[PDB]
Scaffold this active site. Sequence first.
Site, mmCIF file in Angstrom:
data_model
loop_
_atom_site.group_PDB
_atom_site.id
_atom_site.type_symbol
_atom_site.label_atom_id
_atom_site.label_comp_id
_atom_site.label_asym_id
_atom_site.label_seq_id
_atom_site.Cartn_x
_atom_site.Cartn_y
_atom_site.Cartn_z
ATOM 1 N N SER A 106 9.015 -16.457 -0.003
ATOM 2 C CA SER A 106 8.216 -17.464 0.729
ATOM 3 C C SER A 106 9.146 -18.287 1.624
ATOM 4 O O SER A 106 9.871 -17.697 2.435
ATOM 5 C CB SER A 106 7.434 -18.227 -0.323
ATOM 6 O OG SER A 106 6.497 -19.107 0.287
ATOM 7 N N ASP A 188 -2.305 -11.830 1.339
ATOM 8 C CA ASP A 188 -1.624 -13.086 1.054
ATOM 9 C C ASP A 188 -2.590 -14.260 1.229
ATOM 10 O O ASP A 188 -3.167 -14.445 2.306
ATOM 11 C CB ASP A 188 -0.405 -13.207 1.978
ATOM 12 C CG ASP A 188 0.585 -14.260 1.513
ATOM 13 O OD1 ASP A 188 0.158 -15.367 1.124
ATOM 14 O OD2 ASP A 188 1.795 -13.968 1.518
ATOM 15 N N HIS A 225 0.553 -13.978 -2.921
ATOM 16 C CA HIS A 225 1.826 -14.517 -2.434
ATOM 17 C C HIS A 225 2.937 -14.332 -3.460
ATOM 18 O O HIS A 225 4.064 -13.966 -3.106
ATOM 19 C CB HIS A 225 1.670 -16.002 -2.080
ATOM 20 C CG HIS A 225 2.718 -16.512 -1.141
ATOM 21 N ND1 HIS A 225 2.908 -15.983 0.117
ATOM 22 C CD2 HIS A 225 3.630 -17.506 -1.271
ATOM 23 C CE1 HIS A 225 3.889 -16.628 0.722
ATOM 24 N NE2 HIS A 225 4.343 -17.558 -0.098
HETATM 25 C C1 LIG Z 1 3.523 -25.775 -0.324
HETATM 26 C C2 LIG Z 1 2.470 -24.704 -0.111
HETATM 27 C C3 LIG Z 1 2.486 -23.823 -1.357
HETATM 28 O O1 LIG Z 1 3.419 -23.129 -1.600
HETATM 29 N N1 LIG Z 1 1.322 -23.952 -2.221
HETATM 30 C C4 LIG Z 1 1.046 -23.266 -3.474
HETATM 31 C C5 LIG Z 1 1.605 -21.846 -3.507
HETATM 32 C C6 LIG Z 1 -0.476 -23.194 -3.570
HETATM 33 C C7 LIG Z 1 -1.098 -22.135 -4.216
HETATM 34 C C8 LIG Z 1 -2.481 -22.080 -4.286
HETATM 35 C C9 LIG Z 1 -3.242 -23.081 -3.707
HETATM 36 C C10 LIG Z 1 -2.622 -24.137 -3.058
HETATM 37 C C11 LIG Z 1 -1.240 -24.193 -2.987
HETATM 38 C C12 LIG Z 1 2.783 -24.009 1.214
HETATM 39 C C13 LIG Z 1 2.561 -24.719 2.381
HETATM 40 C C14 LIG Z 1 2.828 -24.146 3.610
HETATM 41 C C15 LIG Z 1 3.326 -22.856 3.669
HETATM 42 C C16 LIG Z 1 3.554 -22.143 2.506
HETATM 43 C C17 LIG Z 1 3.285 -22.720 1.279
#
Ligand SMILES: C[C@H](C(=O)N[C@H](C)c1ccccc1)c1ccccc1
EC number: 3.1.1.3
Length: 318
Positions: A106, A188, A225
């Site tokens: 990520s 994803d 993801h």
């Molecule tokens: C911080 C958020 C995240 O990893 N969130 C976690 C994985 C998540 C999982 C399910 C639902 C909401 C957030 C994020 C933001 C921008 C780009 C990539 C990631």
Amino acid sequence: ALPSGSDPAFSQPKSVLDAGLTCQGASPSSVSKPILLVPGTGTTGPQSFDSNWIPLSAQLGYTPCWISPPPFMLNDTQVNTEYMVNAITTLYAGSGNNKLPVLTWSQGGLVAQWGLTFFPSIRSKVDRLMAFAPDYKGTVLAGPLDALAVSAPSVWQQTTGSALTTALRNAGGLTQIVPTTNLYSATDEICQPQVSNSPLDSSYLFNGKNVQAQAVCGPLFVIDHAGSLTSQFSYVVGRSALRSTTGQARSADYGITDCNPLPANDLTPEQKVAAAALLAPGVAAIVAGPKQNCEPDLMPYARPFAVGKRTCSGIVTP
Ligand SMILES: C[C@H](C(=O)N[C@H](C)c1ccccc1)c1ccccc1
Ligand SMILES: [Cl-]
Ligand SMILES: [Cl-]
């Protein structure tokens, strides 16, 4: 051309950066076959990889090393990159001045490519990059910048349209800099768009080995993801990338029989359980973590590549 010349200065002391680097069973200045693992948003190194690539890379003969930038990869992605650059410098010298692989999940892949784009010294020390679900273009699932709820510094920067992703592109960072493999999934649920199997995808790098799982496994293959990092299919692709003589995974090393979305077979029962639950600590970190209403400012070395974008102190100027 890419940025050249000297590395930018670190904003953090070297002692602080050193404290975020750990290797299993060795000191970073004297380590055999290190691999550097760069975690995802809301996690530490152990939280991202204890259930997957820490034991798996050790079983492939590497000493697993990782960074854990505080707090839980929620701070400025540019600062998270300082931890990585310092770690590569240390592990390269500490293993006899031999290049080492970098493996990411990520945001960790965005961090690796930011470091390779703006810190030229590490280009000769990273053997290859194996990035799982990297968000080089950010994600459009968070909405547009002007409708984003208060969010962590690195969440702003991973939003499509951000100054950071703009600067990465304009400095040349959407082209691979070392031999790179990108494994990602059209399903994803965090990073999109990923469905095109084409340069539109957030995980795509020109001249890289770009592996959309559905292009190999078919349209009904489903990995999310975290599964992009932990699945048995991801292990076969990652194993290919780590062993390939070209520095990139090779289509001849994996096929439809490897299309298993569950945690890697060689993981212990306890590990498979933790791998399926990989995200949960990330969400708890984001609830307790920093939040703001604007994107962090670009550091001076990156500002000229995103003139016109808006960050916390206002519009970037030349
Ligand atoms: C911080 C958020 C995240 O990893 N969130 C976690 C994985 C998540 C999982 C399910 C639902 C909401 C957030 C994020 C933001 C921008 C780009 C990539 C990631
Ligand atoms: Cl360009
Ligand atoms: Cl090529």
